[PDB]
Amino acid sequence: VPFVEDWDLVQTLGEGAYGEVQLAVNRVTEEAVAVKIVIKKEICINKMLNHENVVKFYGHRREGNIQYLFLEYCSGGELFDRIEPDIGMPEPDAQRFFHQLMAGVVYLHGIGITHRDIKPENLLLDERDNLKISDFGLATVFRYNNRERLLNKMCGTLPYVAPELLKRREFHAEPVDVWSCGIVLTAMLAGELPWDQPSDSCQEYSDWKEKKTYLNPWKKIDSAPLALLHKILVENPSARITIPDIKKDRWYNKPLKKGAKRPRVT
Numbered sequence: 001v002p003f004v005e006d007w008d009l010v011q012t013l014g015e016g017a018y019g020e021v022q023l024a025v026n027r028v029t030e031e032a033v034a035v036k037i038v039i040k041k042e043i044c045i046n047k048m049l050n051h052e053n054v055v056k057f058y059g060h061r062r063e064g065n066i067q068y069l070f071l072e073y074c075s076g077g078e079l080f081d082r083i084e085p086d087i088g089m090p091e092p093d094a095q096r097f098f099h100q101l102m103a104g105v106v107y108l109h110g111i112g113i114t115h116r117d118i119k120p121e122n123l124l125l126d127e128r129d130n131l132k133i134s135d136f137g138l139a140t141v142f143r144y145n146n147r148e149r150l151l152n153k154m155c156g157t158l159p160y161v162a163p164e165l166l167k168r169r170e171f172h173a174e175p176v177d178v179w180s181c182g183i184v185l186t187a188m189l190a191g192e193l194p195w196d197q198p199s200d201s202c203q204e205y206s207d208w209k210e211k212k213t214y215l216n217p218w219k220k221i222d223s224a225p226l227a228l229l230h231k232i233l234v235e236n237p238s239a240r241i242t243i244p245d246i247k248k249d250r251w252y253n254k255p256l257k258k259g260a261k262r263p264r265v266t
């Protein structure tokens with residue numbers, strides 16, 4: 001079919017260190033895709049991925065010095081824009097998004113991949129508000145030939161990074177992603193970040209370790225999701241709850257949200 005390979009760049013979706021993310025529309029089919037205009041590790045990692053809660057990779061093309069990544073367009077935008085500052089969002093919406101975030105993270109850890117930069121800016125929503133993990137620019141392989149590799153590279157975003165990354169030379173990959181997921185859960189329920197970074201010098205972090213939950217952001221969060229956050233935001237990564245155990249948590253299994261409203265008559 002002629003012109004089926006032609007895409008029009010209609011608008012700017014985002015901007016990173018690399019460059020830009022553009023919304024591309026097919027000339028014939030009008031199919032919408034996101035084009036990332038920038039790397040070798042990101043493409044190789046994206047080629048491994050296939051899951052309903054992970055942004056799809058369609059292919060890549062290099063036009064000299066410029067690399068074009070063809071990725072899934074998520075019309076719902078960023079999770080970040082669903083969080084109302086200092087309020088959050090309704091608890092059933094947060095629970096549904098956290099379930100979907102957990103499905104994506106289990107998938108990635110199962111194939112030996114750690115994202116290393118989970119935050120609401122990187123969590124995108126489709127037309128049906130389904131959460132999709134995006135941006136594998138900082139991602140790495142932590143398990144190969146069923147052998148775990150300890151990480152030492154400090155990366156991510158300080159309000160979301162686990163305390164071991166700042167204190168220890170080496171650390172396990174999986175508890176690091178679990179921690180950042182608990183900070184996302186905190187942001188969704190209180191509309192604010194608990195600390196600038198998880199260090200003893202940070203007063204807000206010291207208050208948390210001293211269980212001063214009568215202070216913000218903790219006082220805005222119900223006791224059931226707050227009991228889960230007490231298990232996730234644990235300083236020792238060896239004592240920190242694992243995802244199989246998050247799946248058995250009381251709040252995680254609490255019925256709260258109704259399914260998407262279907263048309264009906266009386």
Ligand SMILES: O[C@H]1CC[C@H](NCc2ccc3c(c2)Cc2c-3n[nH]c2-c2ccoc2)CC1
Binds near residue numbers: 078
């Ligand atoms: O002017 C406003 C509207 C445009 C913009 N919309 C935000 C936004 C809206 C949508 C998207 C993205 C961002 C990134 C993205 C989007 N869909 N897909 C991808 C993607 C990135 C990496 O892999 C895929 C905010 C400012």
